[PDB]
Amino acid sequence: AEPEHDHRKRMGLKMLLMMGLLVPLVYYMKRHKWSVLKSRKLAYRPPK
Amino acid sequence: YAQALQSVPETQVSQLDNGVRVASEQSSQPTCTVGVWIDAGSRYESEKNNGAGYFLEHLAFKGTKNRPQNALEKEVESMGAHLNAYSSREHTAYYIKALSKDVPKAVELLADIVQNCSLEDSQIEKERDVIVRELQENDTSMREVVFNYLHATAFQGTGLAQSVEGPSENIRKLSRADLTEYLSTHYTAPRMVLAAAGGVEHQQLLELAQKHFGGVPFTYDDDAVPTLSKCRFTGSQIRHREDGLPLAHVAIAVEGPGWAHPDLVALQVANAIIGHYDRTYGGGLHSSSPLASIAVTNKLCQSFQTFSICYSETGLFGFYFVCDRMSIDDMMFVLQGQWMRLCTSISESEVLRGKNFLRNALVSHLDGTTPVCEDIGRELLTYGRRIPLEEWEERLAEVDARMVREVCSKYIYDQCPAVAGPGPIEQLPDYNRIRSGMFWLR
Ligand SMILES: CCCCCCCCO[C@@H]1O[C@H](CO)[C@@H](O)[C@H](O)[C@H]1O
Numbered sequence: 036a037e038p039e040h041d042h043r044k045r046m047g048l049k050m051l052l053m054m055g056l057l058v059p060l061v062y063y064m065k066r067h068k069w070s071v072l073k074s075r076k077l078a079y080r081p082p083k
Numbered sequence: 084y085a086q087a088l089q090s091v092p093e094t095q096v097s098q099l100d101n102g103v104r105v106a107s108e109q110s111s112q113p114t115c116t117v118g119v120w121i122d123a124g125s126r127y128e129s130e131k132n133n134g135a136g137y138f139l140e141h142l143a144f145k146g147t148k149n150r151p152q153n154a155l156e157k158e159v160e161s162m163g164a165h166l167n168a169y170s171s172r173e174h175t176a177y178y179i180k181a182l183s184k185d186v187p188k189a190v191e192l193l194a195d196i197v198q199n200c201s202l203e204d205s206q207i208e209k210e211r212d213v214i215v216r217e218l219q220e221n222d223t224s225m226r227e228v229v230f231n232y233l234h235a236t237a238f239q240g241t242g243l244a245q246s247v248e249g250p251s252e253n254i255r256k257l258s259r260a261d262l263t264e265y266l267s268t269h270y271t272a273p274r275m276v277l278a279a280a281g282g283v284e285h286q287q288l289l290e291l292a293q294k295h296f297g298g299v300p301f302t303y304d305d306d307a308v309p310t311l312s313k314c315r316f317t318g319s320q321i322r323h324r325e326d327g328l329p330l331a332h333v334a335i336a337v338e339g340p341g342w343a344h345p346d347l348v349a350l351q352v353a354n355a356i357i358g359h360y361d362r363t364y365g366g367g368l369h370s371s372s373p374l375a376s377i378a379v380t381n382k383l384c385q386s387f388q389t390f391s392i393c394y395s396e397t398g399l400f401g402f403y404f405v406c407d408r409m410s411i412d413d414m415m416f417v418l419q420g421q422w423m424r425l426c427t428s429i430s431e432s433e434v435l436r437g438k439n440f441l442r443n444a445l446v447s448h449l450d451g452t453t454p455v456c457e458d459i460g461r462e463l464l465t466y467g468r469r470i471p472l473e474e475w476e477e478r479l480a481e482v483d484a485r486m487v488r489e490v491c492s493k494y495i496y497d498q499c500p501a502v503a504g505p506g507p508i509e510q511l512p513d514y515n516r517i518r519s520g521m522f523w524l525r
Pocket residue numbers: 042045046049050053054
């Protein structure tokens with residue numbers, strides 16, 4: 036019914052490892068660019 | 084020319100058994116200017132000490148114990164001599180300009196100030212409110228607040244970050260004492276220099292100084308000069324926004340090498356390439372300085388200036404433009420593009436001029452007596468001795484293209500800059516953007 040089976044799974048393995056590796060990288064990358072905001076600091080200084 | 088340089092008299096130098104270095108350049112000019120240049124600035128202050136040196140400046144002239152206000156003023160005015168001075172973050176100075184017929188008198192006056200300021204508890208309290216006011220005037224000069232803010236963030240958390248005038252709180256409360264405390268701590272011979280230029284002859288100077296500067300060192304501290312705590316640079320920004328102003332100010336910069344370092348020449352040559360603009364120029368045809376040309380073609384700004392402000396062991400190599408609310412972006416875009424171009428694909432045809440333009444400055448850097456004195460004063464204080472035009476020449480007369488690149492790129496490429504901007508700056512893109520404007524998609 037599905038001759039792929041074995042092929043489809045060895046493939047599933049390889050995909051899972053990429054997701055594992057790829058998301059954390061882009062996560063660190065996303066976190067990196069943003070930091071400039073997350074860390075940012077406002078202040079209001081009317082001359083009164 | 085080369086001969087003109089070669090025939091430029093040497094600058095006599097000699098230290099006292101005291102520690103003071105006395106240097107000068109004898110010319111002929113019936114006039115001249117002499118003054119002392121201190122190894123003291125705001126950099127040397129504390130969180131509570133900061134402002135002293137400035138509070139101090141505003142009293143330096145108002146009289147000494149040996150001769151009160153009414154007199155000091157009267158005695159100088161009366162001899163047609165001019166007494167003026169200043170103080171930065173690492174460098175203060177007081178100078179007088181008279182007829183070289185008064186080296187001895189001037190010299191005495193000088194000393195009497197850097198050694199015995201009245202510090203009249205009654206005068207102080209007055210200047211206190213004079214500064215607090217003068218300070219609120221320095222304020223609306225958005226051209227200066229911007230630089231201050233630059234330093235602030237550039238060297239955030241360090242001695243440099245503090246402004247040369249200081250917080251209003253400090254000024255509102257510094258004590259007759261603190262001032263004295265600041266004076267007797269930094270105004271010492273080892274850190275001071277007595278320089279001059281005019282018809283004055285070295286010897287008459289030395290003696291005169293050696294006579295009124297009767298300082299005496301006991302311990303080893305007195306005789307030694309303390310090195311300051313290094314200042315950490317920080318790629319960061321600070322945005323003082325207010326669409327209420329007519330136009331915006333921007334200043335971006337990377338950390339500089341510091342006096343001692345040679346490259347400050349190649350680097351000084353690069354800035355000569357991007358130069359500066361100012362709506363009163365006549366030049367949509369300006370030689371290079373495309374930044375200026377572009378600034379004219381596309382109306383990018385009211386003006387801009389390239390600068391290599393440096394200190395003992397650090398500095399700031401950047402640029403600053405004044406622009407309308409709407410052309411902030413392109414301007415920054417175009418400029419930041421020039422730095423890259425500068426250190427990624429410069430040309431000989433460029434550096435050649437660059438040099439020349441510098442040499443012409445390099446020389447007019449010494450137009451008059453007051454200014455010359457300024458060099459001797461500084462040079463010694465920051466370099467160690469004096470650099471003759473004849474020298475500066477070579478130093479910057481052997482900078483080729485590849486040299487500019489190698490350096491500029493060494494100090495600019497992919498570095499985290501420090502920007503500052505007051506005024507209507509909504510259009511100025513985020514840090515990340517100006518950041519990735521630090522690497523060329525070579
Ligand atoms: C977004 C993450 C994508 C992960 C990559 C998909 C990997 C597919 O890889 C596949 O693995 C099979 C098993 O060895 C091979 O037979 C196929 O030729 C190969 O293309």
